[PDB]
């Protein structure tokens, strides 16, 4: 069956990750394209660990899959000409879309600034939200999550014995992103259209062929699948993953 | 005048983020990165030995660090208004000649014996205290050549039966290599074949030139590395000698 999930990733060209923590493990395989790395990364039971990122080794044509990303305290980014780093946005996004069903970031305090209780802990609050019973929901550490996609967004059980749970205070991506005038200068991370369609990566020619090759417009900010306004529009836009919608404008508020 | 920015490796649109919460920095409003560099290298210029700095292009300020990107307590991160500069002496993976200026992190001898810390008198008592040798960076247990002696960087060894031994750090001349005429050379050779220091490509002094890095994004005009952008027999660089506009560099052909 078909996939194509590379658009879920943030690329850092000519970049790899170096271990600080000596314990960290990786898995490798000979693979023809970064797209394949991505698909293997997002499909789990595909790897022995939850894959958060991978490097594509362009010289040796191999994927290096990681249970960590660049935000882990146990690693650091380093330059490497033959390597491209790809990090699944779910884990690094600093904001939520809607109810934040996809949120897998590291915010670990409630709206009232209470440190969250670890999901694997029954203390101080006993509960049935065990990581086991919720696969793909990344109920890891004490991170705010919305495993059942409920109104209110990501939440957590709190380390305070008197407050069983509370929602966390994680802004909508729509409130975090903003642009000036028509957004020609916009270099933000908005990556969905104003109707919620997922953007196509500029570095891809599928499903839509286009002239905006990042390498020939190095000044336009054609990174990943972020909405951009390279051609004098009212506002930024992107090609769409919907084969029936070549491109659509994005919704980005004016700064201030 | 001191002009020392050419001693630094620049990482554009890059800053350093703390992992170790203890690390301190010093800041000041300054007009140019050149000034940050001079302050960074200047003896007794700061409360710590400055290994690196960031130039904040937005706020026009220097952020001086007692650490560089190779410290386990920090990590590089993207930042549009920040340029990172690291003094090459601490990050160089090789020595020039006797390695007088070597301030790297190699800490084993040629026989793979772990070095004894300079501040320690055990197992070998000695008079090479960091205080007696300012600017020689006798820190931790790193191989050093504080007296600029023939054998290159060395250390007292953690082995009680071996007082000291030279370390095994390659000449930069053996680490760097190029193919054909070096048009593709993107290595770190930064002095001419006669040993003159190269001028940074992003500088127009002491020599004015047309090779603006922004105009030739494909040529590898980074820092002051020897490059062959114009079809020469080998890479070259403008030099910091006002009387020598440019000179070829010495780089061996790759094996």
GROMACS .gro file of C-alpha atoms in nm:
model
  511
    1UNK     CA    1   0.000   0.000   0.000
    2UNK     CA    2   0.098   0.364  -0.053
    3UNK     CA    3   0.254   0.601   0.202
    4UNK     CA    4   0.485   0.904   0.170
    5UNK     CA    5   0.534   1.064   0.512
    6UNK     CA    6   0.855   1.259   0.452
    7UNK     CA    7   0.644   1.573   0.461
    8UNK     CA    8   0.602   1.504   0.834
    9UNK     CA    9   0.972   1.582   0.886
   10UNK     CA   10   1.189   1.888   0.934
   11UNK     CA   11   1.507   1.864   0.727
   12UNK     CA   12   1.844   2.001   0.834
   13UNK     CA   13   2.073   1.976   0.531
   14UNK     CA   14   2.439   1.877   0.572
   15UNK     CA   15   2.368   1.790   0.934
   16UNK     CA   16   2.398   1.484   1.151
   17UNK     CA   17   2.359   1.413   1.521
   18UNK     CA   18   2.650   1.330   1.748
   19UNK     CA   19   2.614   1.129   2.067
   20UNK     CA   20   2.688   1.291   2.401
   21UNK     CA   21   2.507   1.022   2.599
   22UNK     CA   22   2.710   0.704   2.527
   23UNK     CA   23   2.407   0.475   2.579
   24UNK     CA   24   2.215   0.583   2.270
   25UNK     CA   25   2.144   0.319   2.004
   26UNK     CA   26   2.067   0.356   1.634
   27UNK     CA   27   1.955   0.125   1.354
   28UNK     CA   28   2.081   0.140   0.996
   29UNK     CA   29   1.991  -0.002   0.655
   30UNK     CA   30   2.092   0.033   0.291
   31UNK     CA   31   1.816   0.237   0.129
   32UNK     CA   32   1.776   0.423  -0.201
   33UNK     CA   33   1.591   0.738  -0.088
   34UNK     CA   34   1.519   0.955   0.216
   35UNK     CA   35   1.149   0.901   0.145
   36UNK     CA   36   1.195   0.535   0.235
   37UNK     CA   37   1.378   0.628   0.556
   38UNK     CA   38   1.081   0.847   0.647
   39UNK     CA   39   0.820   0.579   0.579
   40UNK     CA   40   1.009   0.321   0.783
   41UNK     CA   41   1.048   0.581   1.059
   42UNK     CA   42   0.679   0.670   1.091
   43UNK     CA   43   0.554   0.313   1.054
   44UNK     CA   44   0.614   0.151   1.392
   45UNK     CA   45   0.651  -0.208   1.477
   46UNK     CA   46   0.873  -0.100   1.190
   47UNK     CA   47   1.156  -0.042   1.437
   48UNK     CA   48   1.252  -0.175   1.784
   49UNK     CA   49   1.210   0.180   1.917
   50UNK     CA   50   0.988   0.480   1.856
   51UNK     CA   51   1.170   0.662   1.575
   52UNK     CA   52   1.178   1.040   1.622
   53UNK     CA   53   1.434   1.123   1.354
   54UNK     CA   54   1.669   0.981   1.094
   55UNK     CA   55   1.971   1.081   0.891
   56UNK     CA   56   1.993   1.005   0.521
   57UNK     CA   57   2.350   0.924   0.422
   58UNK     CA   58   2.358   1.036   0.059
   59UNK     CA   59   2.705   0.894  -0.009
   60UNK     CA   60   2.651   0.541   0.123
   61UNK     CA   61   2.277   0.548   0.054
   62UNK     CA   62   2.166   0.441   0.402
   63UNK     CA   63   1.912   0.538   0.666
   64UNK     CA   64   2.025   0.594   1.022
   65UNK     CA   65   1.713   0.577   1.240
   66UNK     CA   66   1.707   0.736   1.586
   67UNK     CA   67   1.497   0.700   1.904
   68UNK     CA   68   1.604   1.060   1.969
   69UNK     CA   69   1.600   1.396   1.795
   70UNK     CA   70   1.814   1.710   1.807
   71UNK     CA   71   1.625   1.830   2.118
   72UNK     CA   72   1.751   1.541   2.330
   73UNK     CA   73   2.007   1.652   2.589
   74UNK     CA   74   2.209   1.343   2.497
   75UNK     CA   75   2.296   1.455   2.143
   76UNK     CA   76   2.406   1.760   1.946
   77UNK     CA   77   2.392   1.871   1.582
   78UNK     CA   78   2.710   1.872   1.380
   79UNK     CA   79   2.798   1.964   1.023
   80UNK     CA   80   2.844   1.677   0.780
   81UNK     CA   81   2.839   1.732   0.406
   82UNK     CA   82   2.699   1.392   0.308
   83UNK     CA   83   2.425   1.380   0.574
   84UNK     CA   84   2.073   1.520   0.584
   85UNK     CA   85   1.892   1.518   0.918
   86UNK     CA   86   1.515   1.467   0.930
   87UNK     CA   87   1.316   1.513   1.251
   88UNK     CA   88   0.950   1.421   1.288
   89UNK     CA   89   0.775   1.751   1.361
   90UNK     CA   90   0.534   1.593   1.609
   91UNK     CA   91   0.811   1.573   1.867
   92UNK     CA   92   0.959   1.918   1.811
   93UNK     CA   93   0.655   2.130   1.731
   94UNK     CA   94   0.618   2.411   1.985
   95UNK     CA   95   0.244   2.446   1.932
   96UNK     CA   96  -0.070   2.244   1.862
   97UNK     CA   97  -0.317   2.223   1.576
   98UNK     CA   98  -0.671   2.211   1.710
   99UNK     CA   99  -0.708   1.964   1.995
  100UNK     CA  100  -0.342   1.864   1.968
  101UNK     CA  101  -0.403   1.496   1.900
  102UNK     CA  102  -0.062   1.481   1.732
  103UNK     CA  103   0.126   1.673   2.001
  104UNK     CA  104   0.432   1.478   2.113
  105UNK     CA  105   0.645   1.765   2.242
  106UNK     CA  106   0.818   1.801   2.577
  107UNK     CA  107   0.599   2.047   2.765
  108UNK     CA  108   0.562   1.890   3.109
  109UNK     CA  109   0.371   2.140   3.320
  110UNK     CA  110   0.002   2.225   3.347
  111UNK     CA  111  -0.179   2.553   3.282
  112UNK     CA  112  -0.128   2.627   3.652
  113UNK     CA  113   0.243   2.546   3.630
  114UNK     CA  114   0.215   2.212   3.809
  115UNK     CA  115   0.480   1.958   3.711
  116UNK     CA  116   0.305   1.666   3.539
  117UNK     CA  117   0.310   1.319   3.689
  118UNK     CA  118   0.480   1.052   3.477
  119UNK     CA  119   0.234   0.846   3.272
  120UNK     CA  120   0.400   0.523   3.388
  121UNK     CA  121   0.357   0.623   3.755
  122UNK     CA  122   0.046   0.551   3.963
  123UNK     CA  123   0.158   0.807   4.222
  124UNK     CA  124   0.022   1.042   4.333
  125UNK     CA  125  -0.272   0.961   4.101
  126UNK     CA  126  -0.370   0.607   4.007
  127UNK     CA  127  -0.496   0.577   3.648
  128UNK     CA  128  -0.534   0.349   3.347
  129UNK     CA  129  -0.343   0.557   3.092
  130UNK     CA  130  -0.050   0.318   3.062
  131UNK     CA  131   0.176   0.362   2.756
  132UNK     CA  132   0.107  -0.004   2.680
  133UNK     CA  133  -0.267   0.056   2.647
  134UNK     CA  134  -0.201   0.359   2.426
  135UNK     CA  135   0.040   0.280   2.142
  136UNK     CA  136   0.135   0.562   1.907
  137UNK     CA  137   0.020   0.810   2.170
  138UNK     CA  138   0.371   0.843   2.311
  139UNK     CA  139   0.263   0.851   2.674
  140UNK     CA  140   0.629   0.892   2.766
  141UNK     CA  141   0.792   1.061   3.064
  142UNK     CA  142   0.557   1.323   3.210
  143UNK     CA  143   0.477   1.502   2.884
  144UNK     CA  144   0.143   1.670   2.819
  145UNK     CA  145  -0.064   1.455   2.584
  146UNK     CA  146  -0.414   1.425   2.440
  147UNK     CA  147  -0.430   1.047   2.387
  148UNK     CA  148  -0.807   1.035   2.335
  149UNK     CA  149  -0.825   1.351   2.124
  150UNK     CA  150  -1.052   1.533   2.367
  151UNK     CA  151  -1.177   1.892   2.379
  152UNK     CA  152  -0.930   2.108   2.570
  153UNK     CA  153  -0.610   1.970   2.422
  154UNK     CA  154  -0.306   1.801   2.580
  155UNK     CA  155  -0.321   1.746   2.954
  156UNK     CA  156  -0.150   1.541   3.222
  157UNK     CA  157  -0.202   1.397   3.568
  158UNK     CA  158  -0.034   1.642   3.806
  159UNK     CA  159   0.238   1.577   4.063
  160UNK     CA  160   0.013   1.764   4.306
  161UNK     CA  161  -0.184   1.508   4.516
  162UNK     CA  162  -0.481   1.747   4.530
  163UNK     CA  163  -0.511   1.803   4.154
  164UNK     CA  164  -0.568   1.479   3.966
  165UNK     CA  165  -0.525   1.626   3.619
  166UNK     CA  166  -0.520   1.958   3.436
  167UNK     CA  167  -0.488   2.078   3.079
  168UNK     CA  168  -0.154   2.220   2.975
  169UNK     CA  169  -0.103   2.566   2.828
  170UNK     CA  170   0.024   2.500   2.477
  171UNK     CA  171  -0.058   2.765   2.215
  172UNK     CA  172  -0.224   2.699   1.881
  173UNK     CA  173   0.021   2.712   1.592
  174UNK     CA  174  -0.219   2.972   1.450
  175UNK     CA  175  -0.130   3.203   1.742
  176UNK     CA  176   0.245   3.137   1.730
  177UNK     CA  177   0.294   3.207   1.360
  178UNK     CA  178   0.264   3.557   1.212
  179UNK     CA  179   0.378   3.754   0.909
  180UNK     CA  180   0.437   4.112   0.800
  181UNK     CA  181   0.251   4.267   0.504
  182UNK     CA  182   0.197   4.002   0.234
  183UNK     CA  183   0.437   3.748   0.385
  184UNK     CA  184   0.710   3.770   0.123
  185UNK     CA  185   0.946   3.776   0.420
  186UNK     CA  186   0.761   3.499   0.603
  187UNK     CA  187   0.996   3.219   0.706
  188UNK     CA  188   0.779   3.061   0.975
  189UNK     CA  189   0.668   2.702   1.023
  190UNK     CA  190   0.304   2.710   0.904
  191UNK     CA  191   0.276   2.390   0.700
  192UNK     CA  192  -0.099   2.345   0.640
  193UNK     CA  193  -0.335   2.541   0.414
  194UNK     CA  194  -0.615   2.768   0.537
  195UNK     CA  195  -0.855   2.475   0.493
  196UNK     CA  196  -0.624   2.237   0.679
  197UNK     CA  197  -0.469   2.052   0.385
  198UNK     CA  198  -0.114   1.925   0.437
  199UNK     CA  199   0.148   2.106   0.229
  200UNK     CA  200   0.371   1.931  -0.023
  201UNK     CA  201   0.747   1.961   0.033
  202UNK     CA  202   0.904   2.216  -0.202
  203UNK     CA  203   1.185   1.966  -0.267
  204UNK     CA  204   0.929   1.723  -0.409
  205UNK     CA  205   0.770   1.717  -0.755
  206UNK     CA  206   0.490   1.484  -0.649
  207UNK     CA  207   0.196   1.490  -0.645
  208UNK     CA  208   0.250   1.830  -0.809
  209UNK     CA  209   0.526   1.928  -1.051
  210UNK     CA  210   0.648   2.286  -1.010
  211UNK     CA  211   0.925   2.531  -1.096
  212UNK     CA  212   1.018   2.632  -0.741
  213UNK     CA  213   1.322   2.409  -0.693
  214UNK     CA  214   1.482   2.517  -0.363
  215UNK     CA  215   1.829   2.513  -0.524
  216UNK     CA  216   1.736   2.768  -0.791
  217UNK     CA  217   1.554   2.996  -0.547
  218UNK     CA  218   1.794   2.985  -0.249
  219UNK     CA  219   1.652   3.315  -0.123
  220UNK     CA  220   1.285   3.211  -0.104
  221UNK     CA  221   1.297   2.989   0.207
  222UNK     CA  222   1.174   2.676   0.032
  223UNK     CA  223   1.237   2.453   0.333
  224UNK     CA  224   1.034   2.140   0.410
  225UNK     CA  225   0.665   2.211   0.332
  226UNK     CA  226   0.625   2.557   0.484
  227UNK     CA  227   0.383   2.810   0.336
  228UNK     CA  228   0.572   3.073   0.141
  229UNK     CA  229   0.498   3.373  -0.081
  230UNK     CA  230   0.773   3.375  -0.346
  231UNK     CA  231   0.553   3.514  -0.622
  232UNK     CA  232   0.379   3.832  -0.507
  233UNK     CA  233   0.054   3.695  -0.364
  234UNK     CA  234  -0.172   3.844  -0.093
  235UNK     CA  235  -0.032   3.581   0.146
  236UNK     CA  236   0.183   3.266   0.166
  237UNK     CA  237   0.065   2.943   0.007
  238UNK     CA  238   0.184   2.591  -0.063
  239UNK     CA  239   0.138   2.306  -0.306
  240UNK     CA  240  -0.094   2.051  -0.151
  241UNK     CA  241  -0.071   1.675  -0.087
  242UNK     CA  242  -0.424   1.654  -0.228
  243UNK     CA  243  -0.374   1.561  -0.596
  244UNK     CA  244  -0.700   1.747  -0.671
  245UNK     CA  245  -0.573   2.070  -0.517
  246UNK     CA  246  -0.251   2.189  -0.680
  247UNK     CA  247  -0.204   2.478  -0.437
  248UNK     CA  248  -0.394   2.668  -0.170
  249UNK     CA  249  -0.332   2.982   0.037
  250UNK     CA  250  -0.242   2.941   0.403
  251UNK     CA  251  -0.389   3.113   0.707
  252UNK     CA  252  -0.128   3.324   0.885
  253UNK     CA  253  -0.207   3.624   1.102
  254UNK     CA  254  -0.045   3.964   1.071
  255UNK     CA  255   0.222   4.023   1.334
  256UNK     CA  256   0.108   4.233   1.631
  257UNK     CA  257   4.595   4.714   1.616
  258UNK     CA  258   4.545   4.340   1.663
  259UNK     CA  259   4.295   4.210   1.405
  260UNK     CA  260   4.254   3.848   1.519
  261UNK     CA  261   3.921   3.744   1.367
  262UNK     CA  262   4.117   3.539   1.117
  263UNK     CA  263   4.201   3.306   1.407
  264UNK     CA  264   3.835   3.198   1.424
  265UNK     CA  265   3.610   2.945   1.253
  266UNK     CA  266   3.273   3.103   1.169
  267UNK     CA  267   2.942   2.917   1.174
  268UNK     CA  268   2.686   3.154   1.021
  269UNK     CA  269   2.329   3.164   1.154
  270UNK     CA  270   2.446   2.959   1.451
  271UNK     CA  271   2.451   3.006   1.825
  272UNK     CA  272   2.534   2.775   2.116
  273UNK     CA  273   2.273   2.647   2.360
  274UNK     CA  274   2.357   2.543   2.715
  275UNK     CA  275   2.311   2.183   2.827
  276UNK     CA  276   2.524   2.226   3.140
  277UNK     CA  277   2.329   2.480   3.350
  278UNK     CA  278   2.648   2.607   3.520
  279UNK     CA  279   2.802   2.777   3.217
  280UNK     CA  280   2.854   3.155   3.227
  281UNK     CA  281   2.890   3.409   2.947
  282UNK     CA  282   2.982   3.777   2.923
  283UNK     CA  283   2.814   4.024   2.688
  284UNK     CA  284   2.859   4.379   2.560
  285UNK     CA  285   2.725   4.611   2.291
  286UNK     CA  286   2.980   4.618   2.010
  287UNK     CA  287   2.977   4.740   1.648
  288UNK     CA  288   3.159   4.454   1.472
  289UNK     CA  289   3.252   4.086   1.506
  290UNK     CA  290   3.613   4.197   1.461
  291UNK     CA  291   3.593   4.369   1.799
  292UNK     CA  292   3.448   4.059   1.965
  293UNK     CA  293   3.741   3.862   1.823
  294UNK     CA  294   4.003   4.107   1.949
  295UNK     CA  295   3.846   4.115   2.294
  296UNK     CA  296   3.823   3.735   2.289
  297UNK     CA  297   4.191   3.681   2.206
  298UNK     CA  298   4.324   3.970   2.416
  299UNK     CA  299   4.530   3.864   2.718
  300UNK     CA  300   4.342   3.937   3.041
  301UNK     CA  301   4.054   4.071   2.833
  302UNK     CA  302   3.794   3.865   3.017
  303UNK     CA  303   3.726   3.687   3.352
  304UNK     CA  304   3.773   3.354   3.172
  305UNK     CA  305   3.978   3.212   2.887
  306UNK     CA  306   3.759   3.292   2.586
  307UNK     CA  307   3.738   3.006   2.335
  308UNK     CA  308   3.450   3.136   2.126
  309UNK     CA  309   3.196   3.414   2.080
  310UNK     CA  310   2.868   3.485   1.907
  311UNK     CA  311   2.809   3.808   1.721
  312UNK     CA  312   2.448   3.917   1.756
  313UNK     CA  313   2.388   4.101   1.429
  314UNK     CA  314   2.045   4.222   1.542
  315UNK     CA  315   2.132   4.375   1.879
  316UNK     CA  316   2.494   4.439   1.776
  317UNK     CA  317   2.652   4.264   2.075
  318UNK     CA  318   2.927   4.017   2.159
  319UNK     CA  319   2.853   3.705   2.359
  320UNK     CA  320   3.188   3.568   2.481
  321UNK     CA  321   3.219   3.206   2.597
  322UNK     CA  322   3.463   3.007   2.811
  323UNK     CA  323   3.349   2.712   2.596
  324UNK     CA  324   3.320   2.620   2.229
  325UNK     CA  325   3.090   2.392   2.029
  326UNK     CA  326   3.302   2.091   2.123
  327UNK     CA  327   3.221   2.117   2.494
  328UNK     CA  328   2.988   1.836   2.604
  329UNK     CA  329   2.787   2.097   2.796
  330UNK     CA  330   2.664   2.286   2.490
  331UNK     CA  331   2.519   2.223   2.146
  332UNK     CA  332   2.487   2.419   1.821
  333UNK     CA  333   2.150   2.555   1.721
  334UNK     CA  334   2.017   2.758   1.430
  335UNK     CA  335   1.958   3.129   1.488
  336UNK     CA  336   1.921   3.375   1.203
  337UNK     CA  337   2.074   3.680   1.373
  338UNK     CA  338   2.368   3.495   1.531
  339UNK     CA  339   2.712   3.414   1.392
  340UNK     CA  340   2.928   3.174   1.592
  341UNK     CA  341   3.306   3.219   1.598
  342UNK     CA  342   3.535   2.958   1.753
  343UNK     CA  343   3.907   3.010   1.804
  344UNK     CA  344   4.076   2.748   1.588
  345UNK     CA  345   4.346   2.678   1.846
  346UNK     CA  346   4.101   2.485   2.063
  347UNK     CA  347   3.931   2.293   1.783
  348UNK     CA  348   4.216   2.222   1.541
  349UNK     CA  349   4.265   1.848   1.488
  350UNK     CA  350   4.631   1.884   1.393
  351UNK     CA  351   4.944   2.089   1.462
  352UNK     CA  352   5.161   2.326   1.264
  353UNK     CA  353   5.526   2.245   1.327
  354UNK     CA  354   5.607   2.213   1.697
  355UNK     CA  355   5.245   2.274   1.795
  356UNK     CA  356   5.321   2.578   2.007
  357UNK     CA  357   4.964   2.695   1.953
  358UNK     CA  358   4.799   2.357   2.000
  359UNK     CA  359   4.513   2.386   2.249
  360UNK     CA  360   4.309   2.082   2.146
  361UNK     CA  361   4.154   1.808   2.357
  362UNK     CA  362   4.382   1.513   2.281
  363UNK     CA  363   4.484   1.367   2.617
  364UNK     CA  364   4.669   1.042   2.552
  365UNK     CA  365   5.034   0.985   2.465
  366UNK     CA  366   5.176   0.823   2.153
  367UNK     CA  367   5.175   0.500   2.356
  368UNK     CA  368   4.807   0.552   2.440
  369UNK     CA  369   4.876   0.638   2.804
  370UNK     CA  370   4.615   0.869   2.954
  371UNK     CA  371   4.773   1.204   3.041
  372UNK     CA  372   4.809   1.326   3.398
  373UNK     CA  373   4.629   1.654   3.472
  374UNK     CA  374   4.864   1.954   3.467
  375UNK     CA  375   4.726   2.075   3.803
  376UNK     CA  376   4.804   1.740   3.966
  377UNK     CA  377   5.138   1.644   4.124
  378UNK     CA  378   5.043   1.275   4.120
  379UNK     CA  379   5.179   1.043   3.999
  380UNK     CA  380   5.449   1.282   3.871
  381UNK     CA  381   5.550   1.593   4.064
  382UNK     CA  382   5.642   1.884   3.836
  383UNK     CA  383   5.659   2.263   3.802
  384UNK     CA  384   5.429   2.308   3.501
  385UNK     CA  385   5.146   2.473   3.693
  386UNK     CA  386   4.889   2.664   3.482
  387UNK     CA  387   4.971   2.979   3.680
  388UNK     CA  388   5.338   2.962   3.583
  389UNK     CA  389   5.229   2.924   3.220
  390UNK     CA  390   4.959   3.177   3.132
  391UNK     CA  391   4.827   3.151   2.777
  392UNK     CA  392   4.964   2.799   2.738
  393UNK     CA  393   4.626   2.661   2.843
  394UNK     CA  394   4.762   2.387   3.067
  395UNK     CA  395   4.407   2.280   3.140
  396UNK     CA  396   4.276   1.935   3.233
  397UNK     CA  397   4.510   1.666   3.102
  398UNK     CA  398   4.547   1.790   2.745
  399UNK     CA  399   4.863   1.742   2.540
  400UNK     CA  400   5.053   2.070   2.528
  401UNK     CA  401   5.385   2.220   2.421
  402UNK     CA  402   5.416   2.515   2.661
  403UNK     CA  403   5.787   2.568   2.595
  404UNK     CA  404   5.768   2.519   2.219
  405UNK     CA  405   6.007   2.224   2.216
  406UNK     CA  406   6.106   2.003   1.923
  407UNK     CA  407   5.894   1.692   1.979
  408UNK     CA  408   5.561   1.874   1.981
  409UNK     CA  409   5.279   1.854   2.237
  410UNK     CA  410   5.333   1.616   2.528
  411UNK     CA  411   5.206   1.543   2.877
  412UNK     CA  412   5.301   1.386   3.206
  413UNK     CA  413   5.145   1.040   3.199
  414UNK     CA  414   4.906   0.876   3.447
  415UNK     CA  415   5.150   0.584   3.440
  416UNK     CA  416   5.385   0.603   3.743
  417UNK     CA  417   5.667   0.440   3.544
  418UNK     CA  418   5.651   0.691   3.258
  419UNK     CA  419   5.702   1.051   3.366
  420UNK     CA  420   5.615   1.212   3.034
  421UNK     CA  421   5.572   1.126   2.668
  422UNK     CA  422   5.496   1.310   2.346
  423UNK     CA  423   5.148   1.270   2.208
  424UNK     CA  424   5.065   1.153   1.858
  425UNK     CA  425   4.903   1.451   1.688
  426UNK     CA  426   4.944   1.475   1.307
  427UNK     CA  427   5.076   1.777   1.120
  428UNK     CA  428   4.798   1.969   0.950
  429UNK     CA  429   5.007   1.915   0.637
  430UNK     CA  430   4.939   1.539   0.657
  431UNK     CA  431   4.570   1.565   0.745
  432UNK     CA  432   4.478   1.794   0.456
  433UNK     CA  433   4.478   1.670   0.097
  434UNK     CA  434   4.326   1.757  -0.240
  435UNK     CA  435   4.241   1.601  -0.573
  436UNK     CA  436   4.383   1.728  -0.905
  437UNK     CA  437   4.418   2.108  -0.889
  438UNK     CA  438   4.206   2.140  -0.575
  439UNK     CA  439   3.912   2.315  -0.735
  440UNK     CA  440   3.709   2.079  -0.517
  441UNK     CA  441   3.922   2.139  -0.207
  442UNK     CA  442   3.709   2.240   0.091
  443UNK     CA  443   3.960   2.155   0.363
  444UNK     CA  444   4.101   2.361   0.647
  445UNK     CA  445   4.447   2.467   0.524
  446UNK     CA  446   4.467   2.834   0.628
  447UNK     CA  447   4.828   2.936   0.574
  448UNK     CA  448   5.035   2.974   0.258
  449UNK     CA  449   5.314   2.741   0.141
  450UNK     CA  450   5.561   2.984   0.303
  451UNK     CA  451   5.364   2.990   0.627
  452UNK     CA  452   5.192   3.327   0.593
  453UNK     CA  453   4.849   3.357   0.754
  454UNK     CA  454   4.556   3.377   0.513
  455UNK     CA  455   4.316   3.671   0.507
  456UNK     CA  456   3.946   3.591   0.556
  457UNK     CA  457   3.752   3.587   0.229
  458UNK     CA  458   3.474   3.786   0.399
  459UNK     CA  459   3.726   4.065   0.459
  460UNK     CA  460   3.843   4.338   0.221
  461UNK     CA  461   4.147   4.431   0.427
  462UNK     CA  462   4.438   4.441   0.397
  463UNK     CA  463   4.358   4.331   0.040
  464UNK     CA  464   4.053   4.434  -0.161
  465UNK     CA  465   3.915   4.157  -0.381
  466UNK     CA  466   3.618   4.046  -0.591
  467UNK     CA  467   3.564   3.706  -0.430
  468UNK     CA  468   3.278   3.804  -0.198
  469UNK     CA  469   3.146   3.482  -0.042
  470UNK     CA  470   2.788   3.598  -0.109
  471UNK     CA  471   2.866   3.636  -0.481
  472UNK     CA  472   3.033   3.296  -0.505
  473UNK     CA  473   2.824   3.071  -0.277
  474UNK     CA  474   2.965   2.761  -0.453
  475UNK     CA  475   3.335   2.835  -0.403
  476UNK     CA  476   3.370   2.752  -0.032
  477UNK     CA  477   3.491   3.098   0.068
  478UNK     CA  478   3.470   3.018   0.439
  479UNK     CA  479   3.694   3.178   0.702
  480UNK     CA  480   4.048   3.206   0.556
  481UNK     CA  481   4.090   2.864   0.395
  482UNK     CA  482   4.302   2.816   0.085
  483UNK     CA  483   4.077   2.777  -0.218
  484UNK     CA  484   4.114   2.745  -0.595
  485UNK     CA  485   3.817   2.937  -0.740
  486UNK     CA  486   3.998   3.054  -1.053
  487UNK     CA  487   4.160   2.760  -1.229
  488UNK     CA  488   4.505   2.763  -1.069
  489UNK     CA  489   4.744   2.468  -1.032
  490UNK     CA  490   4.655   2.466  -0.660
  491UNK     CA  491   4.460   2.652  -0.389
  492UNK     CA  492   4.580   2.991  -0.270
  493UNK     CA  493   4.471   3.275  -0.044
  494UNK     CA  494   4.509   3.648   0.005
  495UNK     CA  495   4.754   3.694   0.292
  496UNK     CA  496   4.760   3.916   0.600
  497UNK     CA  497   5.096   4.047   0.478
  498UNK     CA  498   5.015   4.386   0.321
  499UNK     CA  499   5.314   4.332   0.088
  500UNK     CA  500   5.197   3.990  -0.031
  501UNK     CA  501   4.853   4.019  -0.191
  502UNK     CA  502   4.812   3.645  -0.244
  503UNK     CA  503   5.020   3.327  -0.229
  504UNK     CA  504   4.970   2.962  -0.320
  505UNK     CA  505   4.921   2.715  -0.037
  506UNK     CA  506   5.088   2.379   0.024
  507UNK     CA  507   4.841   2.091   0.012
  508UNK     CA  508   4.933   1.734  -0.079
  509UNK     CA  509   4.746   1.527  -0.336
  510UNK     CA  510   4.512   1.275  -0.174
  511UNK     CA  511   4.639   0.917  -0.157
   0.00000   0.00000   0.00000
